[model samples]
Target chain A: SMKLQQLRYIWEVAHHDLNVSATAQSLYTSQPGISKQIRLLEDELGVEVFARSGHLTRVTPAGERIIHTAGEILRKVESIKQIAQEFSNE
Target chain B: SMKLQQLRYIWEVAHHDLNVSATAQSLYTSQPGISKQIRLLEDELGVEVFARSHLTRVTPAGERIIHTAGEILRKVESIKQIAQEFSN
Candidate 1:
């Protein structure tokens, strides 16, 4: 269930203070698109991933867990790509 | 390549006669939303998944591959679900 969420979008916002605008800029998508996806993810998980106070955005405790998990998954995926590249070159 | 393209949406239309409006209703989304997502997915795969000729609709040969891929994915996911349920 967690894996089905768009991993790149989740990572960018999580790494960037949950700012949709900044995440959108980094991900080459509009802010609304990022917001919509974030909302969809929130709906799917039934957990508040980010808490907003004025302009500051922060992840909840559960959000931290998800962010860590997603980072690990992305890292593993990159490692797989590197292994594939090495095999191709070998 | 095809896994991340919302498997439910792909399966719905593929199973329900490839009608956007009907697919949207079944998926509980609007027709334009279905159309937009289909366009986005087609762009991602760089191949036409559905061919529309006036009122008749069909999947291209390449789309047949994607459809088969989607079906296999659905089966595997359901199998994974059953395994998880047994674990719990």
Candidate 2:
């Protein structure tokens, strides 16, 4: 599995329609860094997430599944953290 | 708010007890890169996250809050995406 945040980065690019510059601006990183991470994640997963079509972008089929799974995993993790924080506060 | 991944990087370092070397290895980056990011985060937040202690580390309370906030942001973003996916 990829690192949680790397998955998040992928989700963001897809969320923003694969606009690297806009995603980088949202994430507070340079466009190059966002591009690099997307490439790295694709390499690691052996799948393509974004397809460059002119200035527009779209996520591949496999990318969609991965993002879905990532979202599920993130939700569980956050719930766990929230429970921990609640108990800690109590 | 910081980049979600950068925040994750900070959490990983903290989770690993502030060891820059180990954190870099875990995150697949160089030690100096991790060092630079931590420095940047500290500068951005105007507070120290890691303190040098016996060639090892610990995170300040402020750093803890930032990490929590980052985690929260990431979770929400992921959920929003997931829901959006359901429609399309």
Candidate 3:
């Protein structure tokens, strides 16, 4: 299954113009850690989200769609927490 | 943040009439494991999703939260799969 953390990582990487080093810095994690998670997420989805040449060079066209969907899923997940909080207060 | 696995556990327990043992059996997990997850979820939400005593019980308000969460979670599962397939 896709993890929320992975989605966040993917979104951040894509947001950072497919720069693994910058993405890692933004997330306060190691470069290898971010790279591994991006790879893991791509493997689970059965698609290569990034085009790599020793480092992330560019995002694949498929990667764009996946990134968009990841953002949507994250938003919905946040809404779920919001709903829970509302119900809890009621 | 709540885990999807924990949400599934809550859904199954609520579906099984708030029976923890039955939920664990159905999910092929231990009773305590399931109970702990449920407790964690409740703690995260700051509300009890189940009433407790010697056994399990469902509160009126808790039921509504479970039902709504079930609906949202179901859609999320479907969408994730579809998005994966499309991107694959």
Candidate 4:
């Protein structure tokens, strides 16, 4: 199952252009922990979200579509939480 | 509480005709537990999901939440299965 936390990281890494070290630093989580989850997510999708280059990472078109939906799903979920909170607070 | 457990109760109650007693029966929990949990859910959202009366009914706002919550449950289940209920 796709955990929301997984997508949170997926969306974040994409936000930073696949800079996993910076992502780990920003999230205050270990670099390898983030890597492991992304690897698991890649395994789940049966494709790599980022392509390897010489000391760099690049996005595939296929990966971009996934990222788009990752952001979509995550953004919708975040909105839902807000709606729920708003409804509750009123 | 936006918890999966609370969502499960919401879906169950909604599908089971809004009958908390029946919902609890199907879920194998105490009526009070389900009732209390649903109240907590309502408390969190400050919205009444079920119209309380001799016969329970869904509120307009509640139907939307229940509908979305049901889809989420189904999607999560399907995602789990795709992992290796893989054609099985």
Candidate 5:
């Protein structure tokens, strides 16, 4: 499985102007921490979402679709999260 | 968090009419294997999906979860298949 945190990292990179350093800062994590998982996510997806097209890095076509589609699945997990938390904790 | 595999076990039990033994056979494992995961899942989610007694059955909250869980699991499987198109 790709794991939830990896997808969340990908999502964060896109919204944060594709800056790993900034993404790491905002997430209160290290840049290498974010970068390595980005690699891991691509390693699993079998496609690289980020590339240095000159000085600017952006999400490629497959990655966009991956994020877009994965986002839908993520929402459902959030739904599960809500229900999971709302019920008994004991 | 609840893993997809764990959810599958819950859904499978419901399908086999709440028979954990039958579920274990279908999954090709000992009953304790599925039983442990169910216990782990409930521990994670903080709610037991099945109300175990003389007869095991899905609880009220569990019904809604199982429905959405099935949908989520189906979607995840579809995503895996669909993502294969990009794999080189």
Candidate 6:
């Protein structure tokens, strides 16, 4: 249910050590924008990926798996694109 | 950059034996809707998944893609569901 863009955003946040502001800055998006996407993903997954007290303090255990699987999905998606490129070049 | 819905749509068309109308009916969607999604996917991928003269027909390359990528798509779907259930 998560959009591909949301997955990318979530992955970036995790990669930046759950730093919402830093993730937003890195992606050239607003902090609220990044937080909203992450929250959307959490809502869809029915679990909070981050443990927050005011800010995104830490990644939950579920978040780790989500991020890992998101990477796998992205890799397969890239491979599909590569396949398409190969056929396009043919 | 195909949407997951687009992939599922393409996969279903292939599964339904390249019958667009049948695919549309099975999915409870309109023929134009299915065709448009397929066209969008084809345009995004830069390769034609079907050969059309009058009705829809699967191309050789299309078959190859369905055969190869079908499991990959399903696996991703399964993994996503597992992750969600695990988290929930």
Best candidate according to TM-score? 6
Per-residue lDDT tens digits for candidate 4, residues B41-69, read 78877688888864468876677778777
Question: Which rank order by DockQ, best down to worst?
Answer: 6, 5, 3, 4, 2, 1
State the lDDT of candidate 5 residue by residue for A1-90, as single tens digits. Answer: 566677778888888998888999999999888888878878776777776664337777777777776677678777876787777743
Q: What is the TM-score of chain B in candidate 3?
A: 0.80
Name the lDDT value of residue A64 in candidate 5. 78
Comparing 2 with 6 on TM-score, the higher-scoring candidate is 6
Off by over 4 Å in 6: A25-30, B54-57, B67-69, B83-88
Q: What is the TM-score of candidate 2?
A: 0.49
Clashing pairs in 6: none
In candidate 4, the residue pairs with backbone N, CA or C atoms under 3 Å apart (3 or more residues apart, or in different chains) clash, namely A88-B45
The C-alpha RMSD in Å for every predicted model, in order, reads: 8.6, 8.6, 3.1, 5.3, 3.5, 2.6
- For model 6, residues B1-88, the per-residue Cα lDDT tens digits are 5777677777888788778788889888899988887789889888888888844676766766665457557655665676667753
Q: What would you estimate as the lDDT of candidate 1?
A: 0.59
Q: Candidate 3 versus the native: TM-score?
A: 0.76
Candidate 3 per-residue C-alpha lDDT over B1-88 given as tens digits, one digit per residue, 9 for 90 to 100? 6776677877888888878888889888899999888789788877787788744677765676677567646655654565566653
The weakest ten consecutive residues by lDDT in model 6 chain A span A1-10
Best-to-worst order by TM-score is 6, 3, 5, 4, 2, 1
* Model 2 docking grade: incorrect
Name the runs in model 4 displaced over 4 angstroms. Answer: A53-56, B1-64, B67-88
* Model 2, span B1-85: residue lDDT tens: 2444556667777777667788889889898887777677556555565566533455444445555655655654554454456
lDDT of each: 0.59, 0.63, 0.75, 0.71, 0.78, 0.76
For model 6, residues A21-59, the per-residue Cα lDDT tens digits are: 998898888998878887887777777777899677887
Q: What is the TM-score of each candidate against the true structure?
A: 0.48, 0.49, 0.76, 0.61, 0.74, 0.82
Candidate 4 clash total? 1
* Fnat per model, in the order shown: 0.02, 0.00, 0.28, 0.10, 0.52, 0.42
Ten residues in sequence with the least summed lDDT for candidate 3 chain A? A72-81
